[PDB]
Each structure stands twice: as C-alpha cells, then as structure tokens.
C-alpha cells in the first residue's frame, strides 16, 4: 500500500485525551517557499476568480509526534503542531509541483515536508453495538477521491497551557464530524481513543489522526439516523457496514481498491491497535483463526 505510511502506532490499545500533550508553536509552521509565497497567492487568485464563493479557513499543521518510552507513567505522546490554511494547502500539497516542493525541502532543510501546508485531518473507526465498522461513499462530483469509500472525519479549524485546549479541540472535532455527517446523537458516542497517525502519499504526505469511537446503537439504528436527515444532511451519497470479524482481511478484498488513503490508514491502525490480540484467551485458535 504505497499510498499510505504509518507515522505513529499508539500503545495500550490507543491513547485517551488525558495522556496527550500538544506544543502549538510558530517553529512548527511551513517555511516560506524559496521564490516566495507569491506563488500560493497567484493559485488562490486564479481559483477565486472562477469560484468566488470559496473561503479560506485556518487548520492545524502536523510537524511531528513523539511517543514516551512504552510502559511509562505520565504523558505518553507529544504532538508538535503549527498553523496553516486551506489556501496554503491548495498552493502546496494540491499543486501539480508538490513533488518539486518535497525535493527542495530535502535539499534546503533535510525535511521533505518543510515547504508543504500539511493540514492535520481526523478520521474514525466507528464501531456499532452489534460489532460492525461504519463506511461512507464519497460523491463522484467532489475534487479529492471522487467516488471512493471513506470513514467519518474532517480537517478541524482552530478555535501544555494552550496545549490542553488544542488536544480537547482535536478529540471534540472527531465526535462533531460523526454527529454532523452520520446524524448520531452525541450521547450515543464513547470518548475517542487515538489509534495512531497515517500519511497520504497521494496528497504529498499530509497526515490524519485516526481514532476509535464506539456507538451504543446497532448498525440498523445508525442507518436510520443517517438516512432520516435526508440528502442535504450529509456530504456522502451512502452508508454501509462491515463486520469487525471481516475488517481483519479487508486488504485482501475488492473493497480495498475503492478505499481512499486516509480510510485505509484508519483500518490498518484499527487492525494493529484494537484487533491483533496479545493474551492467551483472544489469541487461542478458535477466537483468532489461522491465516
Ligand atoms: C480543490 O479544493 C479542494 C477541497 C477539498 C479537498 N479535500 C479535503 C480537504 C483537504 C485539505 C484541507 F485543508 C481541507 C479539506 C481537496 C481539494
């Protein structure tokens, strides 16, 4: 799967909010482009002169994420974050020249991402009470990954002593994205666990934080809530469900070729962090079938 790389696999089946620190610093920002940020401004002007209803929005930038020594007390992860924007994303990661920017970043900074916006996404492996994961079909008319299968998620917009408010907004945003798109009541959702961070190599290496969320509703009840909003209540064109039993071998199915890279990241991390048992009971052959 060359279109997805794992940047972080969390320990302990996934990290809760209270175990994560963020450092939000202008040291973590994109570097100005070698010939100047005027190239980003020009692409934006061209875009707005065709689609004048578009608007810019701030985003978090991922610089790096460092895990504590395994089995340790105290905070377990440090997220190093900067600020970026939708405009900067359109002029860097989305640009036809994005690979030239990655080569220049290696040369100038020893950092393939130094000249990329790299907005931080969020996604969820959302499980039902009857042990299915939730999938969404993307419209064939959107700009990125048209017609592909996705999981719930989005690209959070901003607003350890400002750090803890940032971690709070990241965890809050994955629940809000589930409530907005799947139309689920917030009180049917568990507090999220961070499974890990995946990079989309088809979008010049931008990263998404991938979470596990449990729902107290069954697959049939989730479907009812999704559909009862009507076509204007969701950006996706359909919902569907795969048994957690069958997610284990999803990379061997015809579905895998239809999954967008960030959804592939979510399912790889679910299989490694929540699946793959470590103990004698769940590791026994009748509960963990060989092959
Ligand atoms: C041409 O416009 C596009 C609009 C949206 C997208 N994809 C989602 C998305 C990625 C990164 C973001 F920062 C914000 C949204 C790509 C291209």
Curated annotation (Swiss-Prot):
KW Metal-binding (keyword) present: yes
Cofactor(s) for this UniProt protein: Mg(2+)
Result, substituting residue 181 to A: Abolishes enzyme activity with UDP-galactose
Catalytic reaction equation(s): UDP-sugar + H2O = UMP + alpha-D-aldose 1-phosphate
Family matches, as InterPro entries: NUDIX_hydrolase_dom, NUDT22/NUDT9-like
A GO CC annotation given for this chain: nucleoplasm
Short sequence motif Nudix box: positions: 163-184
Residues that bind substrate: 55, 86, 138, 143, 150, 155, 157, 262
UniProt-annotated stretches for the region Disordered: 147-159
PROSITE patterns xrefs: NUDIX
GO molecular function, one term: GDP-mannose hydrolase activity
Keywords: Hydrolase, Magnesium, Metal-binding
Substitution effect: residue 177 to A: Abolishes enzyme activity with UDP-galactose
Domain Nudix hydrolase: 117-273
Binding site for Mg(2+): 177, 181
EC number assigned by the record: 3.6.1.45
Main enzyme class: hydrolase
Family membership noted in the UniProt record: Belongs to the Nudix hydrolase family.
Function of the protein: Hydrolyzes UDP-glucose to glucose 1-phosphate and UMP and UDP-galactose to galactose 1-phosphate and UMP. Preferred substrate is UDP-glucose.
PANTHER family per the UniProt record, alphabetical: URIDINE DIPHOSPHATE GLUCOSE PYROPHOSPHATASE, URIDINE DIPHOSPHATE GLUCOSE PYROPHOSPHATASE NUDT22
Name by which UniProt lists this protein: Uridine diphosphate glucose pyrophosphatase NUDT22
Organism in which the protein naturally occurs: Homo sapiens
